Design a protein around this ligand. Sequence first.
Ligand SMILES: Cc1cc2nc3c(=O)[nH]c(=O)nc-3n(C[C@H](O)[C@H](O)[C@H](O)COP(=O)(O)OP(=O)(O)OC[C@H]3O[C@@H](n4cnc5c(N)ncnc54)[C@H](O)[C@@H]3O)c2cc1C
Ligand SMILES: Cc1cc2nc3c(=O)[nH]c(=O)nc-3n(C[C@H](O)[C@H](O)[C@H](O)COP(=O)(O)OP(=O)(O)OC[C@H]3O[C@@H](n4cnc5c(N)ncnc54)[C@H](O)[C@@H]3O)c2cc1C
Ligand SMILES: Cc1cc2nc3c(=O)[nH]c(=O)nc-3n(C[C@H](O)[C@H](O)[C@H](O)COP(=O)(O)OP(=O)(O)OC[C@H]3O[C@@H](n4cnc5c(N)ncnc54)[C@H](O)[C@@H]3O)c2cc1C
Ligand SMILES: Cc1cc2nc3c(=O)[nH]c(=O)nc-3n(C[C@H](O)[C@H](O)[C@H](O)COP(=O)(O)OP(=O)(O)OC[C@H]3O[C@@H](n4cnc5c(N)ncnc54)[C@H](O)[C@@H]3O)c2cc1C
Lengths: 160, 160
Amino acid sequence: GVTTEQQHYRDLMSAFPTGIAVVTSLDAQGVPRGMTCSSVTSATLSPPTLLVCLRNGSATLDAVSATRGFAVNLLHDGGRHAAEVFSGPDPNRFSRVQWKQCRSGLPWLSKDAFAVAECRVSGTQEVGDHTVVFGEVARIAQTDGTPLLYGLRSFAAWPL
Amino acid sequence: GVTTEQQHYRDLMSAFPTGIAVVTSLDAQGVPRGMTCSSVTSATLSPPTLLVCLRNGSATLDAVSATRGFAVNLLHDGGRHAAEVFSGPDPNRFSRVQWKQCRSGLPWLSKDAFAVAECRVSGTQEVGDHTVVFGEVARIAQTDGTPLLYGLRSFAAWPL
Ligand SMILES: Cc1cc2nc3c(=O)[nH]c(=O)nc-3n(C[C@H](O)[C@H](O)[C@H](O)COP(=O)(O)OP(=O)(O)OC[C@H]3O[C@@H](n4cnc5c(N)ncnc54)[C@H](O)[C@@H]3O)c2cc1C
Ligand SMILES: Cc1cc2nc3c(=O)[nH]c(=O)nc-3n(C[C@H](O)[C@H](O)[C@H](O)COP(=O)(O)OP(=O)(O)OC[C@H]3O[C@@H](n4cnc5c(N)ncnc54)[C@H](O)[C@@H]3O)c2cc1C
Ligand SMILES: Cc1cc2nc3c(=O)[nH]c(=O)nc-3n(C[C@H](O)[C@H](O)[C@H](O)COP(=O)(O)OP(=O)(O)OC[C@H]3O[C@@H](n4cnc5c(N)ncnc54)[C@H](O)[C@@H]3O)c2cc1C
Ligand SMILES: Cc1cc2nc3c(=O)[nH]c(=O)nc-3n(C[C@H](O)[C@H](O)[C@H](O)COP(=O)(O)OP(=O)(O)OC[C@H]3O[C@@H](n4cnc5c(N)ncnc54)[C@H](O)[C@@H]3O)c2cc1C
């Protein structure tokens, strides 16, 4: 029954660095929604499926649920400003980055991302106040780029 | 082997770098098992819950499923050899690293890890030929260290 304290858990997870995505979708009104997301994780190749973990009540999760699809925009190492915009309190985040619609309508961050994966929601699992969203990847557009990172409470860039 | 569609997905996920864990457990017969794992992700803070995604039929998933506990060993930048051992074909991996048994029985990679988190399995979800394993974190030990990273088909060190 023993359970670690929340702060010790944050200190642990802060020491597992990751890339950074902006996960996007459309709300029921057709308005683009999205957030900075470091919980992008590969699940399986058969068929290609990733997952993300989104806060319950977030605008992005609501949009993902309404559209049943989402785009994962992997940020290159020039993308820190986008990652800040998409994790902070600013209104109208899509007015502050360049973006375009995918053929599906999903928002693509065309200047700040080096890759965009369009996903269909294939399932969800609530865990506490979050939801794990499974995304079956439908289409990928990918260019050369050096990934942005986040870890130990800082932004960095892939070093190689 | 992989299909063309799976290869494009691999190319995408390769470009999302991460830290590196070795996920360990004991199998039903008490033998240590483990694997190199980059799928560590945070699920929720209340209670502290992470997830990992493990291949179905792997020795490590069999052990985790049988005993319902596992340790997440986060590797420092001196831990590349352990990451290679725990992802390679040789099942004799625990004779190739220095390790210690926790009080609970879980294997701790004492020389190669800067943090260890002991987890109880709180749920699972099969996805294709993998299983997402939710771990409620029971205990963490952590020291300063530079995380090992993997991305773009290479190991690297967190750059600070
Ligand atoms: C590196 C990093 C990684 C992250 N990874 C994840 C992850 O994997 N999963 C996750 O759930 N979260 C994650 N976050 C947090 C997430 O980016 C923010 O919570 C984001 O604001 C969520 O946006 P939203 O529009 O979906 O949600 P909402 O919180 O519903 O915000 C709606 C809108 O209100 C505004 N707003 C934003 N924050 C606030 C606020 N505090 N108060 C008032 N208005 C606000 C913005 O315009 C926002 O678009 C991460 C943050 C960082 C920095
Ligand atoms: C999966 C995930 C979910 C998030 N959910 C929210 C949320 O519900 N509301 C919000 O305002 N911001 C949320 N965020 C943003 C988060 O609280 C931090 O602001 C952001 O992750 C940057 O924190 P840090 O690493 O600098 O430091 P810390 O705040 O010390 O976080 C360290 C690590 O702890 C984990 N973590 C932190 N907060 C949460 C959380 N609330 N739920 C799950 N894991 C967490 C993440 O892995 C994070 O990288 C979330 C981030 C992630 C990655
Ligand atoms: C979630 C996950 C599951 C894995 N499952 C297996 C497995 O069942 N059998 C095996 O022999 N090795 C598996 N591996 C190891 C994997 O095949 C690669 O050898 C390892 O991730 C390093 O690959 P790479 O990044 O150098 O290049 P690549 O082989 O090009 O892989 C690139 C990325 O694709 C993703 N990926 C690759 N293979 C898989 C897979 N099978 N399932 C889900 N995502 C995958 C990972 O995110 C990986 O980093 C898995 C890795 C991960 C992260
Ligand atoms: C950077 C990186 C990240 C990765 N991330 C992931 C991830 O997140 N998820 C994932 O699933 N994989 C991941 N992998 C792949 C994973 O580390 C390897 O597939 C690993 O070898 C699995 O180990 P295992 O002992 O659990 O599995 P197994 O594949 O069962 O066994 C490994 C080897 O031992 C043999 N063996 C197993 N059991 C026995 C036994 N009882 N007696 C004799 N021989 C036996 C097998 O035949 C095989 O040769 C990753 C790899 C890399 C390089």
